[PDB]
């Protein structure tokens, strides 16, 4: 009831309103119920022509994110080995050459040029794939250790802060509740040290610096 549901039988989107569709690799429209029937009728095919697929590659995003097909292939192609191609150079480069030459070929895949095996067969053959992977292994172990500790110190401190607020609430309350209850029985069973007023002033002056 929003775009056209699936181009298959229209028993998914017109009947169920509380479910969204999925998007294959090349930026097409397909409902979620034609995923199960896509497994016994072709095993990874785009349901308008018959384009073959991978392990279903169904991004479930109706936020107009993969509708631009250039977007979802950046998620494909940059994250493919080109992420792994990338970050070894911002570790150690000359000054920008290992950025911008490497920046150039980003444009030379997004245009469906199909000059890629020319670069895939020179992709990691000049350098060490383990040296590539280990920096991917370095950075990912770096960043997951980095993000969790950032998540913990923002979890610990404010909770420690609000508990420090919470105990100071508990501090000021029962202090006030007891020191006057102390000041209550201060008179009861004793008419103050040597005068009507004396230590009952004395106690009426000692209890403010205890909060202060």
């Amino acid at each position: 009831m929003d775009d056209q549901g699936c181009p298959r039988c229209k028993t998914t989107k017109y009947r169920n309103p509380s479910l969204k569709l999925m998007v294959n690799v090349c930026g097409h429209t397909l409902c979620e119920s034609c995923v199960d029937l896509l497994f016994v009728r072709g095993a990874g095919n785009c349901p308008e022509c018959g384009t073959p697929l991978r392990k279903s590659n169904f991004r479930v995003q109706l936020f107009e994110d993969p509708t631009v097909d250039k977007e979802v292939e950046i998620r494909k192609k940059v994250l493919k080995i080109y992420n792994k191609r990338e970050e070894d150079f911002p570790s150690l480069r000359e000054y920008n050459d290992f950025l911008e030459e490497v920046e150039e070929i980003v444009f030379n895949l997004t245009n469906n040029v199909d000059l890629d095996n020319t670069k895939k067969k020179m992709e990691i053959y000049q350098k060490e794939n383990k040296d590539v992977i280990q920096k991917n292994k370095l950075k990912l172990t770096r960043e997951q250790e980095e993000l969790e500790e950032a998540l913990e110190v923002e979890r610990q401190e404010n909770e420690q802060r609000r508990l420090f607020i919470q105990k100071e609430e508990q501090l000021q309350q029962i202090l006030k509740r007891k020191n006057k209850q102390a000041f209550l029985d201060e008179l009861e069973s004793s008419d103050l040290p040597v005068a009507l007023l004396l230590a009952q002033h004395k106690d009426r002056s000692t209890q403010l610096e205890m909060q202060l």
């Binding site: 995003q61 936020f63 107009e64 994110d65 631009v68 250039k70 977007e71 950046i74 940059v78 992420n83 990338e86 000054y95 920008n96 950025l99 911008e100 920046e103 150039e104 980003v106 444009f107 997004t110 993000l147 950032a150 404010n158 802060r161």
Partner: protein
């Protein structure tokens, strides 16, 4: 040195204020009464310090907050210019530059009378340095911006202008000699000796409006009424983002692509010659008015943009970076609309998952946004304006986010549905907005006639050698009547405990306390409501239930509108409807922007009634991060400034209606919160002799006779009020 007559024994109270804050390079905080000629006090010693080349150097920048009072500054100092001129003999050279570029601009009739400022200045600059910079020679298309070329001629030459002009003064010179307010200003900034402009214009971090050369040798800048600096500085870096904006931006995404597609090598090889020069030696392409249409520096306190040409080598590639940005940014928007989320540096981190190359193309974007349009030099600016918003944003997200704050506000604020979600990037450190100010300056003086707690300069989080309390005497009988109400009969509930719409039983006697104020007090009253819907709530019972039945019969009423157009109307009336046979009490809002730029006189406007605690009450969760950071600064501040924020706006609004020092003022206080808060917020010169001498819980019916007793006495017997002649020590 203009003592010029009895000057209500104050210039001597401010004489050593200069000599302490200036000779010793003191940063300096001044209390001032609202009835003290705010430059006649200040500039009379400042212009005295102007001639006093006490070692060598005396700059002057000045700013205030409203352009009519900007000219009102200029207005009588011209006689002060003339004053000692006859007295010291000859007349030396001078310049005071009112530098307006927003409204006052253009003398061409095709350009001028379109209402807004920014868009029409985009038409101006698109004509000058985008059409006549691209299509240089021509006859028709090139349009007649002829006196820019006259600026070319006399910018090759050397004239010497006269004294201080105004916005309109150069416009007749525009129709005679003085050329362009911008240019006729760029050449005068070259040898400017005094600048007056808006407090806002200096404090633009979006387009970093660098006024002078960065010359902190003795950079001498003066500040009046510098109250709501946070409401400047945080709002100066506040970034709103409309969904309607993004979709319009989404529409001119591929619109600009069509310009890319139609241009094959004409503008493209123009880039190719100079994008190579971008790699070889970094220099901005334009030094003229193009930078006015350009984000000068979104994040000013940085070192340099050294490795420009970021992880982006081509233009559609750079355009794809915004396709990588905006389309992800709505992905960072549209799903996020269910939950308000305050995570400023966590966003850019999760963005780094989504954005392929980050933190350089985040920061090196807005110029490459502009520069790849600069090889075009095609797109009209108002068309391109919602885009410059966006490359400003992630640039700000790139640099200063861990001290600052991201807030996402999709829910109900004028949208009953979710029909316009928004987020905001606020900063928090107005310090870090004014730290670069202070590093660029020498030691510069705030003066705020409302600032009673000096403890809020460390809300600016800064250091101060000079911060005292100005005490003036009153031999003017009695300066004013401050009158805290606290009715006992109708049982004061004037703070919104049961809120502005929780009960109208509270509201049953604001009319009663007003009509009797209306019945007694003549001569025009300007009162202060809290907000517009509050104002809409204020008069809500007033029509249907019987309220105005005597109120319109006594004086008349001036509604101020949410729209500033109709708001300026009653104004045209109020200056007139008082000065004829009518009292005509105006009705207004404190926090609304009707409360600046006026300086009410004894002629019209001489009384103010408080209505409620003048605090914020509106914007959700802009508090808490601002709260907790000052709780990360001083830790008991929830109670503290959330009093003073009301108070710093209160006498900002309330303490206005007296100018000289006999001008009267009936500043009564209908308030439930007075016990410490009003007392802390009122001036130490003003709590002392006047506030609650023996009048606190003053029921209006009793407080009726107070103003009666006040005015009737105060109207007669005036001749002599604190007459100073010669110097007789007195020693305060």
């Amino acid at each position: 040195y203009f003592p010029y007559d009895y000057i209500y024994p104050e210039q001597f109270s401010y004489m050593r204020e200069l000599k302490r804050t200036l000779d010793a390079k003191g940063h300096g905080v001044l209390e001032m009464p609202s009835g003290t000629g705010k430059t006649v006090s200040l500039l009379a010693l400042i212009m005295a310090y102007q001639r006093a080349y006490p070692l060598e150097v005396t700059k002057l920048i000045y700013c205030s907050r409203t352009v009519p009072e900007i000219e009102k500054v200029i207005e009588e100092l011209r006689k002060l210019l003339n004053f000692y001129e006859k007295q010291e003999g000859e007349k030396l050279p001078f310049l005071g530059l009112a530098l307006s570029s927003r409204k006052n601009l253009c003398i061409h009739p095709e350009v001028t009378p379109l209402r807004f400022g920014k868009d029409v200045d985009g038409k101006c600059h698109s004509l000058t340095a985008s059409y006549v910079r691209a299509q240089y020679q021509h006859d028709t298309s090139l349009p007649h911006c002829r006196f820019y070329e006259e600026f070319d001629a006399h910018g090759r030459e050397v004239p010497l202008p006269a004294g201080i002009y105004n916005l309109d003064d150069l416009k007749a010179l525009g129709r005679r000699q003085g050329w362009c307010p911008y240019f006729l200003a760029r050449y005068s900034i070259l040898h400017a000796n005094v600048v007056v402009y808006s407090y806002h214009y200096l404090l633009d971090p979006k387009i970093a409006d660098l006024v002078s050369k960065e010359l902190a040798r003795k950079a001498v800048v003066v500040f009046d009424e510098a109250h709501n600096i946070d409401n400047v500085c945080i709002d100066s870096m506040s970034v709103n983002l409309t969904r309607r904006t993004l979709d319009r931006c989404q529409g001119n995404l591929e619109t600009l692509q069509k310009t890319v597609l139609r241009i094959k090598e004409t503008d493209e090889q123009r880039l190719r010659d100079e994008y190579r020069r971008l790699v070889e030696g970094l220099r901005e392409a334009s030094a003229a008015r193009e930078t006015d249409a350009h984000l000068a520096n979104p994040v000013l306190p940085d070192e340099v943009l050294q490795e420009a040409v970021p992880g982006s080598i081509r233009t559609a590639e750079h355009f794809l970076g915004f396709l990588r940005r905006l389309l992800e940014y709505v992905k960072w928007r549209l799903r996020v609309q269910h939950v308000v989320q305050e995570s400023p540096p966590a966003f850019l981190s999760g963005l780094a998952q989504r954005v392929c190359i980050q933190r350089k193309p985040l920061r090196f974007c807005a110029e490459r946004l502009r520069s790849l349009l600069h090889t075009l030099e095609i797109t009209d600016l108002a068309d391109f304006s919602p885009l410059t918003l966006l490359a400003n944003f992630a640039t700000l997200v790139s640099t200063y986010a861990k001290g600052f704050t991201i807030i996402i506000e999709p829910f109900d604020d004028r949208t009953p549905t979710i029909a316009n979600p928004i987020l905001h990037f606020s900063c928090m450190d107005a310090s870090l907005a004014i730290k670069p100010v202070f590093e660029r300056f020498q030691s510069v003086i705030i003066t705020s006639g409302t600032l009673s707690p000096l403890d809020i300069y460390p809300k600016i989080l800064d250091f101060h050698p000079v911060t005292m309390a100005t005490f003036t005497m009153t031999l003017a009988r009695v300066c004013l009547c401050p009158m805290i109400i606290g009715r006992g009969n109708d049982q004061v509930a004037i703070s919104s405990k049961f809120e502005t719409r929780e009960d109208i039983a509270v509201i049953r006697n604001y009319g009663n306390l007003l009509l009797e104020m209306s019945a007694v007090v003549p001569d025009g009253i300007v009162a202060f409501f809290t907000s517009y819907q509050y104002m809409e709530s204020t008069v809500a019972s007033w029509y249907e239930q019987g309220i105005l039945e005597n109120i319109q019969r006594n004086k008349l009423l001036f509604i101020e509108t949410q729209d500033g157009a109709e708001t300026s109307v009653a104004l045209e009336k109020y200056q007139e409807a008082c000065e004829n046979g009518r009292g005509a009490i105006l009705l207004s809002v404190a926090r609304g922007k009707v409360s600046e730029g006026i300086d009410f006189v004894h002629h019209y406007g001489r009384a103010v009634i408080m209505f409620g605690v003048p605090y914020v009450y509106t914007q959700s969760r802009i508090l808490k991060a601002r709260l907790e950071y000052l709780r990360d600064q001083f830790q008991i501040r929830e109670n503290d400034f959330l009093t003073f924020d009301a108070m710093r706006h209160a006498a900002q609004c309330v303490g206005r209606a007296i100018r000289g020092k006999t001008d009267y003022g009936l500043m009564v206080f209908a308030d439930k919160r007075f016990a410490r808060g009003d007392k802390r917020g009122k001036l130490p010169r003003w709590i002392q002799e006047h506030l609650t001498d023996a009048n606190l819980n003053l029921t209006v019916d009793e407080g009726v006779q107070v103003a009666k007793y006040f005015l009737r006495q105060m109207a007669q017997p005036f001749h002599r009020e604190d007459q100073l002649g010669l110097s007789l020590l007195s020693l305060e």
